[PDB]
């Protein structure tokens, strides 16, 4: 989940998956006016990793972000095409520095092997300056965990507060019921006295 | 009322002058800058900072001065380093000085270069034209990394959509005005995002912080108006019920 949140921005992670731009407009006209929610169009790019997972794992990886998440077919397809999770060699093992520097140097194929990788709890993006020295340069940033993409309680505090509210309201209901019973007893006594007086 | 109080607190903090440009990026950002300057031994390119003085907001763009501030303040935290050893030294100095925030590392030596290869050719002046640049090395680094030379600041939502549909020479991003609280970021021809302007002015603005103080005062006034409207509506409801 942390890897998905790092590779796929939270705006896209909160964005509604839309099949096409036409439906995007047609269903954003009534929705965006009410609630400002990002909409990510279902693209049509590649859905499979560009290279076999063996070559990726030769650097010390495990697989890809596409392999590391599941979910709705259209949403997963949009993630694989727009965000291209399958193009991200993702792992929970940090790469060896030798292979890291091998990736820093452009590969003999003409470019770097990958522009976005995840090793351990860190993410490395390798880019190149458009002009000037145009050095092929990496960038490593630590990856932080999150509870997204997990239908689990963590507002746990809200659950406890609501349970306390349930208990208090049930107790109040029982107390009111007891007061009603007392009122009924008083009414019965009054009616008994009235019957005695009438007799 | 809590939102109004938070806006008042922000107004007081900005007005006191404690929201200094040096501390705008982070409270201990200056500590990190001093440490990298003192520990740029492995840095073939010094991790020069702060870049807000070198990359300041320019007038005529107060419509998205906050939007440009947000964008290039998210992008500004990336400094210039040469080799991954410099990234390790950056992490070491972060652990040493204990900077409250984290600085992304760009492993590219500073160099000055022409960006006319992908210069934006549109009616809207580029972000480079929207920013005062002092150091040519830092200016070139920002242009290359952020691709601001391929961006024209289109001023309206549908105008941005149409202009991106036209796709002139190097037109990728559009920063349109909706209000002083939030604006529009547009890309992809029809991709539109309503983005709230960044409250913390990390990016240096040539205009004094008093503009931010007055903006926060206006925000407080509008939120008090909203509070009054809500209170009156609920008072009407409760009066009818009673």
Instruction: Return the HEC string of B32-43.
Output: HHHHHHHCCCCC
Residue B194 and residue A36: Cβ atoms within 8 Å?
Answer: yes
CB B58 within 8 A of CB B129: yes
Residue B113 and residue A129: Cβ atoms within 8 Å?
Answer: yes
CB atoms within 10 A of CB A186: 10
Consecutive H or E run containing B192: strand B191-196
> Which residue do the tokens 């983005």 mark?
B195
- What six digits make up the tokens of A108? 């003999």
At how many Å resolution was this determined? 8.0
Environment class of B54 (CB within 10 Å of its CB; exposed 0-12, middle 13-18, buried 19+): buried
Number of residues assigned to chain B: 242
Task: Give the whole-angstrom CA distance, residue A33 versus residue A61.
Answer: 44
Consecutive H or E run containing B56: strand B55-57
Q: Using DSSP bridges, classify how beta strands A122-124 and A140-142 pair: parallel, antiparallel or unpaired.
A: antiparallel
CA distance A199 to chain B (A): 45
Determine which of A102, A137, A141, A144 to mutate to test the interface with B (most B C-beta atoms within 10 Å).
A137
- Whether residue A27 lies within 8 A of chain B, CB to CB, comes out as no
Chain A residues close to B118, C-beta within 8 Å:
130
CB A71 within 8 A of CB A83: no
Nearest to A38 by CA among A70, A85, A86, A82: A82
Rounded to 10 deg, the angle between the B84-97 and B29-38 helix axes is: 130
Nearest to A69 by CA among A57, A81, A79, A59: A79
Chain B residues close to A25, C-beta within 8 Å:
190
CB B163 within 8 A of CB B50: no
CB atoms within 10 A of CB B13: 16
- Whether residue B196 lies within 8 A of chain A, CB to CB, comes out as no
CB atoms within 10 A of CB A159: 11
Which of B104, B107, B140 is opposite residue A132, by nearest beta carbon? Answer: B140
* Residues B90, B96, B99, B103, Cα dihedral to 10°: 10
Chain A residues close to B101, C-beta within 8 Å:
none
Task: Print burial letters for A35-69: b (CB count within 10 Å at least 16), e (below 16).
Answer: eeebbbbbbeeebebeeeeeebeebbbbbbbbebb
- Whether residue A101 lies within 8 A of chain B, CB to CB, comes out as yes
Residue A130 and residue B190: Cβ atoms within 8 Å?
Answer: no
CA distance B59 to chain A (A): 28
CA distance B114 to chain A (A): 7
Residue B107 and residue A138: Cβ atoms within 8 Å?
Answer: yes
- Whether residue A24 lies within 8 A of chain B, CB to CB, comes out as yes
Start-to-end Cα distance in chain B: 25
Q: Using DSSP bridges, classify how beta strands A136-137 and A127-128 pair: parallel, antiparallel or unpaired.
A: antiparallel
Question: What is the three-class DSSP state of B132?
Answer: strand
CB A136 within 8 A of CB A101: no
CB B138 within 8 A of CB B48: yes
Angle CA(B210)–CA(B212)–CA(B215) in degrees, nearest 5? 110
CB B96 within 8 A of CB B90: no
Nearest to B19 by CA among B215, B206, B201: B201
Task: Give the whole-angstrom CA distance, residue B109 versus residue B214.
Answer: 41
CB A70 within 8 A of CB A150: no
- H/E/C letters for each residue in chain A? CHHHHHHCCHHHHCCEEECCHHHHHHHHCCCCCCCCCCEEECCCCCCCCCCCHHHHHCCCCCEECCCCCCCCHHHHHHHHHHHCHHHCEECCCCCCHHHHHHHHCCCCCCCCCCCCEEECCEEECCEECCCCCCCEECCEEECCCCCCCCCCCCCHHHHHHHHHHHHHHHHHHHHHHHHHHHHHHHHHHHHHHHHHHHC
- What six digits make up the tokens of A64? 């890809």
Start-to-end Cα distance in chain A: 81
Q: Using DSSP bridges, classify how beta strands A16-18 and A39-41 pair: parallel, antiparallel or unpaired.
A: parallel
A&B contacts, CB < 8 Å: 57
What Cα–Cα distance (Å) separates residue B71 from each residue in B115, B147, B156, B196?
A: 20, 12, 18, 11
Nearest to A124 by CA among A96, A83, A149: A96
Number of Cα atoms under 13 Å in the Cβ half of residue A81: 15
- What six digits make up the tokens of A61? 């990886």
Nearest to B194 by CA among B203, B183, B186: B183
CB B37 within 8 A of CB B74: no
Residue B102 and residue A138: Cβ atoms within 8 Å?
Answer: no
Question: What is the three-class DSSP state of B141?
Answer: helix
Note if the bond before B84 is cis, omega within 30 degrees.
Answer: no
- Whether residue B194 lies within 8 A of chain A, CB to CB, comes out as yes
Which of B107, B113, B194 is opposite residue A132, by nearest beta carbon? Answer: B113
Task: Give the whole-angstrom CA distance, residue B16 versus residue B23.
Answer: 13
CB atoms within 10 A of CB B229: 10
Residue B111 and residue A133: Cβ atoms within 8 Å?
Answer: yes
Method: cryo-EM
* Residues A143, A144, A145, A148, Cα dihedral to 10°: -90
Name the residue in chain A with its Cα closest to that of B88.
A140
């Amino acid at each position: 989940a942390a890897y998905l949140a790092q590779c796929v921005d939270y705006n896209t992670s909160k964005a509604l998956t839309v099949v096409d731009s036409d439906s995007y407009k047609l269903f954003a006209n009534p929705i965006l006016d009410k609630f400002k929610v990002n909409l990510r169009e279902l693209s049509s790019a590649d859905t499979t990793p560009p290279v076999p997972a063996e070559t990726v794992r030769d650097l010390g990886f495990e697989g890809y972000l596409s392999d590391f998440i599941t979910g709705d077919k259209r949403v997963m397809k949009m993630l694989c095409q727009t965000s291209k999770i399958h193009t991200i060699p993702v792992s929970r093992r940090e790469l060896t520095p030798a292979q890291i520097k091998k990736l820093i140097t452009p590969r003999p194929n003409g470019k770097i092997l990958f522009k976005r990788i995840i090793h351990g709890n860190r993410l490395v993006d390798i880019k190149q300056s458009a002009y000037g020295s145009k050095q092929v340069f990496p960038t490593d940033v630590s990856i932080k965990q999150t509870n997204f993409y997990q239908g689990s309680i963590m507002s746990n505090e809200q659950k406890i507060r609501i349970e306390n509210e349930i208990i208090n309201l049930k107790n109040e209901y029982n107390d009111r019921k007891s007061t009603l019973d007392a009122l009924s007893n008083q009414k019965s006594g009054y009616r008994h006295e009235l019957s005695e007086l009438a007799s | 009322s809590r939102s109004i109080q938070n806006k008042k607190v922000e107004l007081q903090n900005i007005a006191k002058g404690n929201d200094t440009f040096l501390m705008n990026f982070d409270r201990n950002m200056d500590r990190l800058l001093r440490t990298i300057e003192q520990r740029k031994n492995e840095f073939e390119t010094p991790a020069i900072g702060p870049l807000g003085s070198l990359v300041t907001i320019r007038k005529g763009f107060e419509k998205w001065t906050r939007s440009i501030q947000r964008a290039i303040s998210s992008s500004l935290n990336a400094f210039v380093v040469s080799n991954p050893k410099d990234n390790r030294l950056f992490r070491d100095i972060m652990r040493s000085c204990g900077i409250r925030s984290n600085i992304p590392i760009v492993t590219y030596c500073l160099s000055q270069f022409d960006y006319s290869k992908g210069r934006a050719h549109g009616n809207y002046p580029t972000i480079v034209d929207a920013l005062e640049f002092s150091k040519p090395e830092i200016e070139c680094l920002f242009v290359d990394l952020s691709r601001i030379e391929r961006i024209v600041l289109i001023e309206d939502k549908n105008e941005a959509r149409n202009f991106l549909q036209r796709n002139p020479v190097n037109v990728n991003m559009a920063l349109s005005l909706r209000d002083r609280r939030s604006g529009f970021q547009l890309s992809g021809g029809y991709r539109l995002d309503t983005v709230t302007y960044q409250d913390k002015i990390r990016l240096k603005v040539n205009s004094s912080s008093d503009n931010g103080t007055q903006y926060l005062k206006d925000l407080i006034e509008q939120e008090t108006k909203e509070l009054q409207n809500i209170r009156d509506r609920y008072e009407e409801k409760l009066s009818e019920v009673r």
